[PDB]
Amino acid sequence: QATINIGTIGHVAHGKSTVVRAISGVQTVRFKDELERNITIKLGYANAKIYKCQEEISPKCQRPGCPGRYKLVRHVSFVDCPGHDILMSTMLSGAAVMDAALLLIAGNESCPQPQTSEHLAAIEIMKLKHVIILQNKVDLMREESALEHQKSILKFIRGTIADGAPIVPISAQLKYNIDAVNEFIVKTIPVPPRDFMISPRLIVIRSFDVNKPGAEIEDLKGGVAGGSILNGVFKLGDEIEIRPGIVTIQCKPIFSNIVSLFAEQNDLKFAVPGGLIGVGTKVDPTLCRADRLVGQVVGAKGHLPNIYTDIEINYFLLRRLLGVKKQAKVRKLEPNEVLMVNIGSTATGARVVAVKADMARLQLTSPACTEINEKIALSRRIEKHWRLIGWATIKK
């Protein structure tokens, strides 16, 4: 199945979807009539092939001269998030689901673009320094201007946790120069190991009913959860608890036996981790209605994640903020103020109980589940929409 969760990052109206299309052919759709013209809310999904010519996009070597057929390397799946500074929660969720990143910078649009920088920062925070950098709108720029842009980018990427991350000049519309990108996908991104015995944990980003308009109820379908595994091969025929729960104010975890564990385009026996998977469960498709299973944790039955509202956070912050042009000073965190705490996939609205030296105690208005220590990206409301302040770990 899908071997490595590779994410796509860039500015809004630059062409992440376009890039995906160029790579795979699989469309992110762009939907709900708002997003048909403009920008997606959900993650965009695509399945790209790597079968190398060693003597590729398709498993045949008729194209690159030598008739010695395309030698199977990998199959990779995309994690394409919204690159808008309003919808950052989704991006954050994607980030602690990904194994590696793909940057997208346009030629004619500037080098210190705010959103892109923010994305980069997020990636750095959440252990995602494996970034393949792509020059995108180069089918517009001069023989000198492009070079200048590249130089500027290089200059920028000197103090960042990205040091010598590779840059490729592609056209997402004209279909050129993606060979290099493909090569890098095997070269610069090795897949981090993901075993059998590391306790099975599924991180849900999407809720899906496949209940088509027109059918009869004597021919029914269950609930499908679109979520990623980063530990534990889920096999067909297992019982599950989804632990952030269902709301009564108290919450109670949801129990579902596996109908299917579906990856690629064809349903499989297994779901080997480091991939984003559509899990058919006996759970109602009415709870998989639109975007209900977003930021929920799934464990195999006989397991104890903990649903915390009162949290011990170890926090770290910036000197100067991101999301804006206008990079504003980080004023100190203020008590009993609504922050957004992004933990793996959750985007919970939290109130500050205490501020110490490097630790903070937080109240959650919506309960999140901590199994391990859990990776956090933090966010705040200063300029209406949510800006990225810093990062944390749950000290548990």
Binding site: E143, Q150, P166, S171, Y176, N177
Partner: peptide
Amino acid sequence: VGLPYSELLSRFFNILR
């Protein structure tokens, strides 16, 4: 490195419509 990139860029420039 931005010089195994330079070659790529050159190639791209060569094969534009």
